[PDB]
Amino acid sequence: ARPCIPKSFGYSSVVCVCNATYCDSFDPPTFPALGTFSRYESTRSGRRMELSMGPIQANHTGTGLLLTLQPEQKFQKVKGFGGAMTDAAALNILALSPPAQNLLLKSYFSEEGIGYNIIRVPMASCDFSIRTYTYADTPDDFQLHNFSLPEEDTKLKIPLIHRALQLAQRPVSLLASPWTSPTWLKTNGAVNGKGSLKGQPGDIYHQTWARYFVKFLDAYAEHKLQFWAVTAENEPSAGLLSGYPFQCLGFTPEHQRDFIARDLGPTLANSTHHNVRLLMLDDQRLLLPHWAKVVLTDPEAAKYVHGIAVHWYLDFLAPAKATLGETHRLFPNTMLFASEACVGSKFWEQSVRLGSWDRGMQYSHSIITNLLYHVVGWTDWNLALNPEGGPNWVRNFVDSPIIVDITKDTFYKQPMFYHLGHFSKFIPEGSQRVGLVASQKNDLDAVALMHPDGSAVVVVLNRSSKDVPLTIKDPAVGFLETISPGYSIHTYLWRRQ
Ligand SMILES: *[C@@H]1O[C@H](CO)[C@@H](O[C@@H]2O[C@H](CO)[C@@H](O[C@@H]3O[C@H](CO[C@H]4O[C@H](CO)[C@@H](O)[C@H](O)[C@@H]4O)[C@@H](O)[C@H](O)[C@@H]3O)[C@H](O)[C@H]2NC(C)=O)[C@H](O)[C@H]1NC(C)=O
Ligand SMILES: *[C@@H]1O[C@H](CO)[C@@H](O)[C@H](O)[C@H]1NC(C)=O
Ligand SMILES: *[C@@H]1O[C@H](CO)[C@@H](O)[C@H](O)[C@H]1NC(C)=O
Ligand SMILES: *[C@H]1O[C@H](CO)[C@@H](O)[C@H](O)[C@H]1F
């Protein structure tokens, strides 16, 4: 492991500095010997997944906070964690020298980094593009004879995805999402603004749009990339809004239901891509459970829908219990999956805040709350941005766990990177969320998972200023005596047998 080279930009914590010759690294994860536990600790003060070990005690006495593992109490299985290979991300990574590129990609995708196993891939242009394009801009090409991948895919995104897969030891799942159709399929004839597909589900416009998904997957398959899943549309509610500023395609939940049932579901099912999963919604969880009810109460739509993709941007107005909890209750066999998060997009948020501990805590608080309400995975937005939070053709600049400083052939790993890694590094695909109850009211956020081998993983976030002594009880094994410092995040690992 190589330590963090810290740098302050005058915010609440440090970034770790990487360049062509140096980047901080971790050891590949391992469980310690039976009878001991591992603690990985990150702090506002500058600790970055510092490993310490402790004994498991047979007995515990006292009045302090106790978190008791309920290992028999099983919830959702984890799909995983990752981020988005946008045009903007690809441009920022490729602007680094090749050795710096390799250290950034290792930071995310290697076991010396944080073990990402998900990459979200835009289907043509979005706001995090410098050019507006689709794969089929030749007007009225209903046959899609002129469908093709431009250089944004063949020269930037696809070769970086191959390099990520070659560094990953875990199987990586690709997730595709479209922002806009070709403008000649749209009521408004523009990539942005209020507008939907022309006509109605089951017609030539909708059949052409469903076939565009298959042409997309065919073209990526010619480049030796296969997808785990696609979404039915990125943020379909966006295209319902007057003056929506960037690429969108409006669907009411009824429109999405009928498009899935008549066009997208049957087209994917009748193709070589029949095993690719379809996720609905791909929008703010405030739209649940209503959207889920509208789509999944129609059996002809429900039979094509694998899962419900959620974005975090209205989480502050949408309690998890009423949205995620109620959706899981109504549709327990339809997985919930978090597919897009970033800080900096809101009117009251600065785009980039280098070294922000607050933004790290936003990520870990989000991931814990999602895991506690049945969500199987959590996906960051842009993998890397420049110090302005771009590039972005509408200047919708936001923050990223990695910020690239081209002039210094440098990149900065922010608190968000480490907060994400406290989960992604230690929670492989097939891990299962298990119960964890507190003996008393407390200011901590915590979640417990059982690793596929039966071992325990617990993440404890303290967003308060106060140090909290605590004990973790595993009824089979014994007690971990520990302390959760103010503004810390911990990952605990131990074997149970
Ligand atoms: C890529 O980033 C590398 C890591 O930041 C850069 O290496 C660094 O370059 C600076 C300037 O030459 C050096 O700073 C000096 O550091 C010494 C103290 O060195 C020791 O203690 C530090 C702090 O714990 C430790 O990190 C080092 O390993 C040393 O043990 C001071 O006495 C000087 O006054 C001055 O501050 C760094 O030593 C050096 N860091 C490392 C880890 O090598 C490298 O220059 C960058 N590459 C490019 C191409 O820009
Ligand atoms: C733990 O508590 C039990 C019950 O009082 C006691 O009999 C036993 O000796 C204790 N074990 C250890 C290892 O202290
Ligand atoms: C679209 O494809 C057809 C059939 O291969 C070709 O003849 C036509 O010239 C193409 N149009 C453009 C604008 O590339
Ligand atoms: C999700 O939100 C981010 C932040 O505004 C946008 O950049 C994406 O296009 C959207 F899908």
Coordinates of C-alpha atoms and ligand atoms in Angstrom, one line a residue:
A1 CA 0.0 0.0 0.0
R2 CA 1.2 3.6 -0.8
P3 CA -0.1 6.3 1.5
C4 CA -2.2 9.4 0.5
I5 CA -0.1 12.5 -0.5
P6 CA -2.6 15.0 1.1
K7 CA -3.4 18.4 -0.3
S8 CA -5.8 21.0 1.2
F9 CA -7.8 23.4 -1.1
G10 CA -9.2 25.2 2.0
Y11 CA -12.3 22.8 2.5
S12 CA -13.0 20.5 5.4
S13 CA -10.5 17.7 4.4
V14 CA -7.7 16.8 2.0
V15 CA -7.6 15.2 -1.5
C16 CA -4.9 12.5 -2.2
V17 CA -2.6 13.7 -5.0
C18 CA -1.7 11.3 -7.9
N19 CA 0.4 11.8 -11.0
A20 CA 2.4 9.8 -13.7
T21 CA 4.8 8.4 -11.0
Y22 CA 2.8 8.2 -7.7
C23 CA -0.7 7.3 -6.5
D24 CA -1.9 6.1 -3.1
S25 CA -2.9 2.4 -3.1
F26 CA -4.5 -0.2 -0.9
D27 CA -3.8 -3.9 -0.4
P28 CA -6.3 -6.3 -1.9
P29 CA -9.0 -7.0 0.7
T30 CA -8.7 -10.1 3.0
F31 CA -10.5 -11.3 6.1
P32 CA -8.1 -11.6 9.1
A33 CA -7.8 -14.9 11.1
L34 CA -10.8 -16.2 13.1
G35 CA -10.9 -14.5 16.5
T36 CA -9.6 -11.1 15.2
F37 CA -11.4 -8.3 13.3
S38 CA -10.0 -5.7 10.8
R39 CA -11.0 -2.0 10.9
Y40 CA -10.5 0.3 7.9
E41 CA -10.7 3.9 9.0
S42 CA -11.0 7.2 7.1
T43 CA -11.3 10.5 8.9
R44 CA -11.8 14.2 8.1
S45 CA -8.4 14.7 9.8
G46 CA -6.8 12.8 6.9
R47 CA -6.7 9.0 7.6
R48 CA -7.5 7.1 4.3
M49 CA -8.6 3.4 4.9
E50 CA -6.0 2.9 7.6
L51 CA -6.0 -0.8 8.6
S52 CA -5.9 -1.7 12.3
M53 CA -6.8 -5.1 13.9
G54 CA -8.4 -6.1 17.2
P55 CA -9.4 -9.2 19.2
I56 CA -13.0 -10.6 19.3
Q57 CA -13.9 -10.9 23.1
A58 CA -16.1 -13.8 24.4
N59 CA -17.9 -11.4 26.8
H60 CA -19.1 -7.7 27.1
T61 CA -20.3 -5.6 30.1
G62 CA -21.5 -2.0 30.1
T63 CA -24.1 0.7 29.2
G64 CA -22.4 1.9 25.9
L65 CA -24.0 1.6 22.4
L66 CA -24.2 -2.1 21.3
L67 CA -24.9 -3.0 17.6
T68 CA -26.0 -6.6 17.4
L69 CA -25.6 -8.6 14.1
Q70 CA -28.7 -10.6 13.1
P71 CA -26.8 -12.8 10.6
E72 CA -29.9 -15.2 10.1
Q73 CA -32.1 -12.2 9.1
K74 CA -31.5 -11.9 5.3
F75 CA -32.4 -9.0 2.9
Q76 CA -31.2 -8.2 -0.6
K77 CA -28.2 -9.6 -2.5
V78 CA -25.7 -7.0 -3.7
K79 CA -25.1 -6.4 -7.5
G80 CA -22.3 -3.9 -6.8
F81 CA -20.9 -0.4 -7.2
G82 CA -19.3 1.8 -9.9
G83 CA -19.5 4.9 -12.0
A84 CA -20.3 6.4 -15.4
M85 CA -18.0 6.4 -18.5
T86 CA -19.4 9.7 -20.0
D87 CA -17.7 11.5 -22.9
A88 CA -16.6 14.0 -20.2
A89 CA -15.1 11.3 -18.0
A90 CA -13.3 9.7 -21.0
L91 CA -11.9 13.0 -22.2
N92 CA -10.6 13.9 -18.7
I93 CA -8.9 10.4 -18.2
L94 CA -7.4 10.4 -21.7
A95 CA -6.0 14.0 -21.2
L96 CA -3.7 12.5 -18.6
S97 CA -0.3 10.9 -19.6
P98 CA -0.7 7.1 -20.2
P99 CA 1.0 6.2 -16.8
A100 CA -1.3 8.7 -14.9
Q101 CA -4.3 7.2 -16.9
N102 CA -3.3 3.7 -15.7
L103 CA -3.1 4.8 -12.0
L104 CA -6.6 6.5 -12.2
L105 CA -8.1 3.4 -13.8
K106 CA -6.3 1.2 -11.2
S107 CA -7.7 3.5 -8.4
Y108 CA -11.2 2.5 -9.5
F109 CA -11.0 -1.0 -11.0
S110 CA -8.0 -2.9 -9.4
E111 CA -8.0 -4.7 -6.0
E112 CA -5.2 -2.2 -5.1
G113 CA -8.0 0.4 -5.7
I114 CA -11.7 0.2 -4.7
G115 CA -12.8 -2.8 -6.9
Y116 CA -15.6 -1.2 -8.9
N117 CA -17.7 -3.8 -10.8
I118 CA -20.3 -1.5 -12.6
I119 CA -19.8 1.0 -15.5
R120 CA -22.8 3.0 -16.7
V121 CA -22.5 3.9 -20.4
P122 CA -24.6 6.7 -22.0
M123 CA -26.2 5.7 -25.3
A124 CA -24.8 8.7 -27.4
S125 CA -24.6 12.3 -26.1
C126 CA -25.8 13.8 -22.7
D127 CA -24.9 17.0 -20.8
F128 CA -21.5 15.5 -20.1
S129 CA -20.6 15.6 -23.8
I130 CA -19.0 18.5 -25.8
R131 CA -21.0 17.6 -29.0
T132 CA -24.8 16.9 -29.4
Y133 CA -25.3 13.7 -31.4
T134 CA -27.2 10.4 -31.5
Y135 CA -26.3 7.2 -33.2
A136 CA -28.9 7.9 -36.0
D137 CA -29.0 11.6 -36.9
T138 CA -29.7 10.9 -40.7
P139 CA -33.4 12.2 -40.9
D140 CA -36.3 9.7 -41.3
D141 CA -33.9 6.7 -41.3
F142 CA -36.6 4.3 -39.9
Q143 CA -34.6 1.3 -41.2
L144 CA -31.6 2.6 -39.1
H145 CA -29.2 1.9 -42.1
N146 CA -27.2 5.0 -41.0
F147 CA -27.0 3.9 -37.3
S148 CA -23.3 4.0 -36.2
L149 CA -21.0 4.6 -33.3
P150 CA -18.9 7.8 -33.6
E151 CA -15.4 8.3 -32.2
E152 CA -16.8 9.2 -28.7
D153 CA -17.6 5.5 -28.5
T154 CA -14.9 3.8 -30.7
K155 CA -11.9 6.0 -29.8
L156 CA -12.7 7.2 -26.2
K157 CA -15.3 5.2 -24.2
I158 CA -14.9 1.6 -25.6
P159 CA -11.0 1.4 -25.3
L160 CA -11.2 2.8 -21.7
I161 CA -13.9 0.3 -20.9
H162 CA -11.6 -2.5 -22.2
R163 CA -8.7 -1.2 -20.1
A164 CA -11.0 -1.1 -17.0
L165 CA -12.1 -4.7 -17.7
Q166 CA -8.4 -5.9 -18.0
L167 CA -7.6 -4.3 -14.5
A168 CA -10.8 -5.7 -12.9
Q169 CA -10.4 -9.1 -11.1
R170 CA -14.2 -9.1 -10.5
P171 CA -16.7 -9.6 -13.3
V172 CA -17.7 -6.0 -14.5
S173 CA -21.4 -5.3 -15.3
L174 CA -22.1 -2.6 -18.0
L175 CA -25.3 -0.6 -17.7
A176 CA -26.6 1.4 -20.8
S177 CA -29.0 4.4 -20.6
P178 CA -30.2 6.8 -23.4
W179 CA -30.9 10.6 -22.8
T180 CA -32.4 11.5 -26.3
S181 CA -33.5 9.7 -29.4
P182 CA -32.8 11.1 -32.8
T183 CA -34.7 14.4 -33.1
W184 CA -36.7 13.1 -36.1
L185 CA -38.4 10.6 -33.7
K186 CA -39.5 13.4 -31.3
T187 CA -42.6 15.6 -31.1
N188 CA -40.3 18.7 -30.6
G189 CA -37.6 17.9 -33.2
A190 CA -34.8 18.9 -30.7
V191 CA -32.4 16.9 -28.3
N192 CA -33.6 19.0 -25.3
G193 CA -36.8 20.8 -24.2
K194 CA -40.2 19.2 -23.6
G195 CA -40.8 16.4 -26.1
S196 CA -41.5 12.7 -26.4
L197 CA -41.4 10.1 -29.1
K198 CA -44.0 10.9 -31.9
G199 CA -47.2 8.9 -32.0
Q200 CA -47.9 6.0 -29.5
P201 CA -46.3 2.8 -28.3
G202 CA -46.6 -0.1 -30.9
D203 CA -46.2 2.3 -33.9
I204 CA -43.3 2.9 -36.4
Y205 CA -41.6 5.6 -34.1
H206 CA -41.7 3.3 -31.0
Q207 CA -40.6 0.2 -33.0
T208 CA -37.7 2.2 -34.6
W209 CA -36.7 3.5 -31.1
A210 CA -36.8 -0.1 -29.6
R211 CA -34.7 -1.3 -32.6
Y212 CA -32.1 1.5 -31.8
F213 CA -31.5 -0.3 -28.5
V214 CA -30.7 -3.6 -30.3
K215 CA -28.4 -1.7 -32.9
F216 CA -26.6 -0.1 -29.9
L217 CA -26.0 -3.6 -28.2
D218 CA -25.1 -5.1 -31.7
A219 CA -22.4 -2.3 -32.2
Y220 CA -20.9 -2.6 -28.7
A221 CA -20.9 -6.5 -29.2
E222 CA -18.9 -6.0 -32.5
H223 CA -16.4 -4.2 -30.1
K224 CA -16.4 -7.3 -27.7
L225 CA -18.5 -5.5 -25.0
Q226 CA -21.7 -7.2 -23.6
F227 CA -24.2 -5.4 -21.3
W228 CA -25.7 -6.7 -18.0
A229 CA -28.6 -4.2 -18.2
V230 CA -30.2 -1.2 -20.1
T231 CA -32.6 1.4 -18.6
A232 CA -35.8 2.3 -20.5
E233 CA -34.7 6.0 -20.6
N234 CA -32.5 8.3 -18.4
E235 CA -34.9 10.4 -16.2
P236 CA -38.0 10.1 -18.4
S237 CA -39.8 12.7 -16.3
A238 CA -37.2 15.3 -17.5
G239 CA -38.6 15.3 -21.1
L240 CA -42.1 16.3 -19.6
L241 CA -40.6 19.6 -18.4
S242 CA -40.9 22.9 -20.4
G243 CA -37.4 24.2 -21.3
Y244 CA -35.5 21.1 -20.0
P245 CA -32.0 22.3 -20.8
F246 CA -30.2 19.1 -22.1
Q247 CA -30.7 15.8 -23.9
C248 CA -34.0 14.1 -22.7
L249 CA -37.0 12.1 -24.0
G250 CA -40.3 12.5 -22.0
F251 CA -42.3 9.5 -20.8
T252 CA -45.3 9.5 -18.4
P253 CA -45.3 6.2 -16.4
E254 CA -48.2 5.1 -18.7
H255 CA -46.1 5.9 -21.8
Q256 CA -43.1 3.9 -20.3
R257 CA -45.5 1.0 -19.4
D258 CA -46.9 0.7 -22.9
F259 CA -43.4 1.3 -24.6
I260 CA -41.9 -1.5 -22.5
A261 CA -44.9 -3.9 -23.1
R262 CA -45.3 -3.2 -26.9
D263 CA -41.9 -2.2 -28.2
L264 CA -38.8 -2.4 -26.0
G265 CA -39.6 -5.6 -24.1
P266 CA -40.6 -7.7 -27.1
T267 CA -37.7 -6.3 -29.3
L268 CA -35.0 -7.1 -26.7
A269 CA -36.7 -10.5 -26.0
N270 CA -36.7 -11.5 -29.7
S271 CA -32.9 -10.5 -30.1
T272 CA -29.5 -12.0 -29.4
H273 CA -29.6 -9.6 -26.4
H274 CA -32.5 -11.4 -24.7
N275 CA -30.5 -12.0 -21.5
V276 CA -29.8 -8.3 -21.1
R277 CA -31.8 -7.0 -18.0
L278 CA -34.3 -4.1 -18.5
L279 CA -34.5 -1.5 -15.6
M280 CA -37.5 0.9 -15.5
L281 CA -37.8 4.4 -14.0
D282 CA -34.0 5.4 -13.9
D283 CA -35.3 8.6 -12.2
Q284 CA -35.8 10.3 -8.8
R285 CA -37.3 8.0 -6.0
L286 CA -40.0 10.7 -5.3
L287 CA -41.7 9.0 -8.4
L288 CA -42.1 5.7 -6.3
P289 CA -44.1 3.8 -5.6
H290 CA -46.5 5.4 -8.2
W291 CA -44.3 4.6 -11.3
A292 CA -43.7 1.0 -10.1
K293 CA -47.5 0.6 -9.6
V294 CA -48.4 2.0 -13.1
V295 CA -45.8 -0.2 -15.0
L296 CA -45.7 -3.4 -12.9
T297 CA -49.5 -3.8 -12.4
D298 CA -49.6 -4.4 -16.2
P299 CA -48.5 -8.1 -16.6
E300 CA -47.4 -7.5 -20.3
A301 CA -45.0 -4.8 -19.1
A302 CA -44.0 -6.5 -15.8
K303 CA -42.8 -9.7 -17.6
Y304 CA -39.9 -7.6 -19.3
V305 CA -38.9 -5.5 -16.2
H306 CA -36.0 -6.9 -14.1
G307 CA -35.5 -3.9 -11.8
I308 CA -36.3 -0.3 -10.9
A309 CA -33.4 2.2 -11.3
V310 CA -33.4 5.2 -8.9
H311 CA -31.4 8.5 -8.9
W312 CA -30.6 10.4 -5.7
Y313 CA -31.4 14.1 -6.6
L314 CA -34.8 14.3 -4.7
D315 CA -33.8 12.0 -1.8
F316 CA -33.9 15.1 0.5
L317 CA -37.7 15.4 -0.3
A318 CA -38.5 11.7 -0.6
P319 CA -38.2 9.6 2.6
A320 CA -36.7 6.1 1.9
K321 CA -39.5 4.2 3.8
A322 CA -42.4 5.8 1.7
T323 CA -40.5 5.3 -1.6
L324 CA -38.0 2.4 -1.6
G325 CA -39.6 0.7 1.4
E326 CA -43.2 0.8 0.0
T327 CA -41.9 -0.2 -3.5
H328 CA -40.1 -3.3 -2.0
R329 CA -43.3 -4.2 0.0
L330 CA -45.5 -4.1 -3.1
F331 CA -43.0 -5.6 -5.6
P332 CA -40.5 -7.6 -3.5
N333 CA -39.1 -9.7 -6.5
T334 CA -38.3 -6.5 -8.5
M335 CA -34.8 -5.4 -7.5
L336 CA -34.2 -1.6 -6.7
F337 CA -30.9 -0.3 -8.0
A338 CA -29.3 3.2 -7.6
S339 CA -28.0 4.3 -11.0
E340 CA -26.9 8.0 -10.7
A341 CA -25.6 10.3 -7.9
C342 CA -23.4 13.4 -7.8
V343 CA -23.0 16.5 -5.7
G344 CA -22.8 19.9 -7.3
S345 CA -25.8 19.8 -9.6
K346 CA -28.1 21.8 -7.2
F347 CA -28.6 25.6 -7.3
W348 CA -27.4 25.8 -3.6
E349 CA -24.2 23.6 -4.3
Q350 CA -20.9 24.8 -5.8
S351 CA -19.9 22.5 -8.7
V352 CA -16.5 21.3 -7.2
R353 CA -15.3 21.5 -3.6
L354 CA -11.8 19.9 -3.6
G355 CA -11.3 17.8 -0.4
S356 CA -15.0 18.2 0.9
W357 CA -15.5 15.8 3.8
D358 CA -19.3 16.8 3.6
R359 CA -19.6 15.4 0.1
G360 CA -17.9 12.1 1.1
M361 CA -20.4 11.8 4.0
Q362 CA -23.3 12.5 1.5
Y363 CA -22.1 9.4 -0.6
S364 CA -21.7 7.0 2.4
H365 CA -25.0 8.2 4.0
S366 CA -26.8 7.6 0.7
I367 CA -25.2 4.2 0.2
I368 CA -26.1 3.0 3.7
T369 CA -29.7 4.4 3.5
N370 CA -30.2 2.7 0.1
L371 CA -28.8 -0.6 1.5
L372 CA -31.1 -0.4 4.5
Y373 CA -34.1 -0.1 2.1
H374 CA -33.4 -3.1 -0.2
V375 CA -31.3 -1.4 -2.9
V376 CA -28.8 -3.9 -4.5
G377 CA -26.2 -1.4 -5.9
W378 CA -25.1 2.2 -6.1
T379 CA -23.7 4.0 -9.1
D380 CA -21.7 7.2 -9.2
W381 CA -22.0 9.6 -12.2
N382 CA -18.9 10.9 -14.0
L383 CA -15.8 8.8 -13.1
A384 CA -13.6 11.9 -13.5
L385 CA -14.1 15.7 -14.2
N386 CA -11.8 18.7 -14.6
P387 CA -11.5 21.3 -11.7
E388 CA -14.5 23.3 -13.1
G389 CA -16.7 20.1 -13.0
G390 CA -16.7 19.7 -16.8
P391 CA -16.6 19.5 -19.6
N392 CA -20.4 19.9 -20.2
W393 CA -22.0 21.5 -23.3
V394 CA -24.7 23.3 -21.1
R395 CA -22.2 24.1 -18.3
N396 CA -24.1 21.8 -15.9
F397 CA -20.8 21.4 -13.9
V398 CA -20.8 19.0 -10.9
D399 CA -18.4 17.2 -8.6
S400 CA -16.6 13.8 -9.1
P401 CA -14.6 11.5 -6.7
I402 CA -11.6 12.1 -9.1
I403 CA -10.7 15.6 -10.4
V404 CA -8.1 15.8 -13.2
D405 CA -5.6 18.8 -13.3
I406 CA -4.3 18.4 -16.9
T407 CA -1.7 21.2 -16.5
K408 CA 0.0 19.3 -13.7
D409 CA -0.6 15.8 -15.2
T410 CA -2.2 15.2 -11.8
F411 CA -5.5 13.8 -10.5
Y412 CA -7.1 14.3 -7.0
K413 CA -8.9 11.5 -5.1
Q414 CA -11.5 13.2 -3.0
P415 CA -13.3 12.0 0.2
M416 CA -16.2 10.8 -2.0
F417 CA -13.7 8.2 -3.6
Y418 CA -12.7 6.8 -0.1
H419 CA -16.4 6.9 1.2
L420 CA -17.5 4.9 -1.9
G421 CA -14.5 2.5 -1.5
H422 CA -15.5 1.7 2.2
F423 CA -18.4 -0.3 0.4
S424 CA -17.1 -1.2 -3.1
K425 CA -13.8 -2.7 -1.9
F426 CA -15.3 -4.9 0.8
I427 CA -18.8 -5.9 -0.6
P428 CA -18.4 -8.3 -3.5
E429 CA -21.3 -9.1 -5.8
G430 CA -23.5 -11.8 -4.1
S431 CA -23.0 -10.3 -0.6
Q432 CA -26.3 -10.2 1.3
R433 CA -27.5 -7.4 3.6
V434 CA -28.3 -8.9 7.1
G435 CA -29.8 -7.3 10.2
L436 CA -28.0 -5.0 12.6
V437 CA -29.9 -3.4 15.6
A438 CA -28.8 -0.7 18.0
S439 CA -29.3 -1.0 21.8
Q440 CA -30.1 2.8 22.0
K441 CA -30.9 5.8 19.8
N442 CA -27.5 7.1 18.3
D443 CA -26.1 9.5 15.6
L444 CA -24.4 6.6 13.6
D445 CA -25.3 5.3 10.2
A446 CA -24.5 1.5 10.0
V447 CA -25.2 -1.5 7.7
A448 CA -24.2 -5.2 8.0
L449 CA -23.6 -7.5 5.1
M450 CA -22.7 -11.2 4.9
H451 CA -19.9 -11.8 2.4
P452 CA -20.6 -14.8 0.1
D453 CA -18.1 -17.0 2.2
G454 CA -20.3 -16.3 5.4
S455 CA -17.9 -13.6 6.9
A456 CA -19.2 -10.3 8.3
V457 CA -18.7 -6.8 6.8
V458 CA -20.1 -3.7 8.8
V459 CA -19.8 -0.1 7.7
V460 CA -20.2 2.6 10.4
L461 CA -20.5 6.3 9.5
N462 CA -20.3 9.0 12.1
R463 CA -21.6 12.3 10.6
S464 CA -21.6 13.9 14.1
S465 CA -18.6 15.8 15.7
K466 CA -18.7 13.5 18.8
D467 CA -16.6 10.3 19.3
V468 CA -19.0 7.3 20.0
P469 CA -17.5 4.3 21.9
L470 CA -19.4 1.2 20.8
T471 CA -19.4 -2.6 20.8
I472 CA -20.4 -4.8 17.8
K473 CA -21.9 -8.2 18.9
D474 CA -21.8 -11.2 16.7
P475 CA -23.8 -13.9 18.6
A476 CA -21.8 -16.8 17.1
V477 CA -18.3 -15.3 17.7
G478 CA -18.3 -12.5 20.4
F479 CA -17.7 -8.8 20.7
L480 CA -15.7 -6.1 18.9
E481 CA -14.8 -3.2 21.3
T482 CA -14.3 -0.1 19.2
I483 CA -14.9 3.6 18.9
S484 CA -16.4 5.7 16.0
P485 CA -14.6 9.0 16.0
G486 CA -16.5 12.2 15.0
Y487 CA -16.5 12.6 11.2
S488 CA -15.2 9.1 10.5
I489 CA -16.2 6.1 8.4
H490 CA -15.2 2.5 9.3
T491 CA -15.4 -0.8 7.6
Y492 CA -15.2 -3.8 9.9
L493 CA -14.4 -7.3 8.6
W494 CA -14.4 -10.6 10.6
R495 CA -14.7 -14.3 10.0
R496 CA -17.6 -16.1 11.8
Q497 CA -16.2 -19.7 11.5
Ligands
LIG1 C1 4.3 13.1 -8.4 O1 3.9 13.2 -7.0 C2 5.0 12.8 -6.2 C3 4.5 12.7 -4.7 O2 4.0 14.0 -4.4 C4 6.1 13.9 -6.3 O3 7.1 13.6 -5.4 C5 7.4 14.5 -4.5 O4 8.1 15.7 -4.8 C6 8.3 16.7 -3.8 C7 9.2 17.8 -4.4 O5 10.4 17.2 -4.8 C8 9.0 16.1 -2.6 O6 8.9 17.1 -1.5 C9 9.9 17.4 -0.7 O7 9.7 16.5 0.3 C10 10.7 16.4 1.3 C11 10.2 15.4 2.4 O8 10.3 14.1 1.9 C12 9.9 13.1 2.7 O9 8.8 13.2 3.5 C13 7.6 13.3 2.8 C14 6.4 13.6 3.7 O10 6.0 12.5 4.4 C15 7.4 11.9 2.1 O11 6.2 11.9 1.3 C16 8.6 11.6 1.2 O12 8.4 10.2 0.7 C17 9.9 11.8 1.9 O13 10.1 10.7 2.7 C18 11.0 17.8 1.9 O14 12.2 17.7 2.8 C19 11.2 18.8 0.8 O15 11.4 20.1 1.4 C20 10.0 18.8 -0.1 O16 8.8 19.1 0.6 C21 8.4 14.8 -2.1 O17 9.4 14.1 -1.3 C22 8.1 13.8 -3.3 N1 7.2 12.7 -2.8 C23 7.4 11.4 -3.0 C24 6.5 10.5 -2.3 O18 8.3 11.1 -3.7 C25 6.6 13.9 -7.7 O19 7.5 15.0 -7.8 C26 5.4 14.1 -8.7 N2 5.9 13.9 -10.0 C27 5.8 14.8 -11.0 C28 6.3 14.3 -12.4 O20 5.4 15.9 -10.8
LIG2 C1 -17.6 -15.0 30.2 O1 -18.8 -14.9 31.1 C2 -19.2 -16.2 31.6 C3 -20.5 -16.1 32.3 O2 -20.4 -15.3 33.6 C4 -18.0 -16.7 32.5 O3 -18.4 -17.8 33.3 C5 -16.8 -16.9 31.7 O4 -15.7 -17.4 32.5 C6 -16.4 -15.6 30.9 N1 -15.4 -15.9 29.9 C7 -14.3 -15.2 29.8 C8 -13.5 -15.6 28.6 O5 -14.1 -14.2 30.4
LIG3 C1 -27.2 5.7 -45.3 O1 -27.0 4.3 -45.6 C2 -27.4 4.0 -47.0 C3 -27.4 2.5 -47.2 O2 -26.2 1.8 -46.8 C4 -26.4 4.8 -47.9 O3 -26.7 4.5 -49.3 C5 -26.6 6.3 -47.7 O4 -25.8 7.1 -48.6 C6 -26.3 6.6 -46.2 N1 -26.6 8.0 -45.9 C7 -25.7 8.8 -45.2 C8 -26.1 10.2 -45.0 O5 -24.6 8.3 -44.8
LIG4 C1 -28.4 13.0 -13.7 O1 -28.1 14.2 -13.0 C2 -26.8 14.7 -13.5 C3 -26.6 16.0 -12.6 O2 -27.4 17.1 -13.1 C4 -26.8 15.0 -14.9 O3 -25.6 15.4 -15.3 C5 -27.2 13.7 -15.7 O4 -27.3 14.0 -17.1 C6 -28.5 13.2 -15.2 F1 -28.9 12.1 -15.8

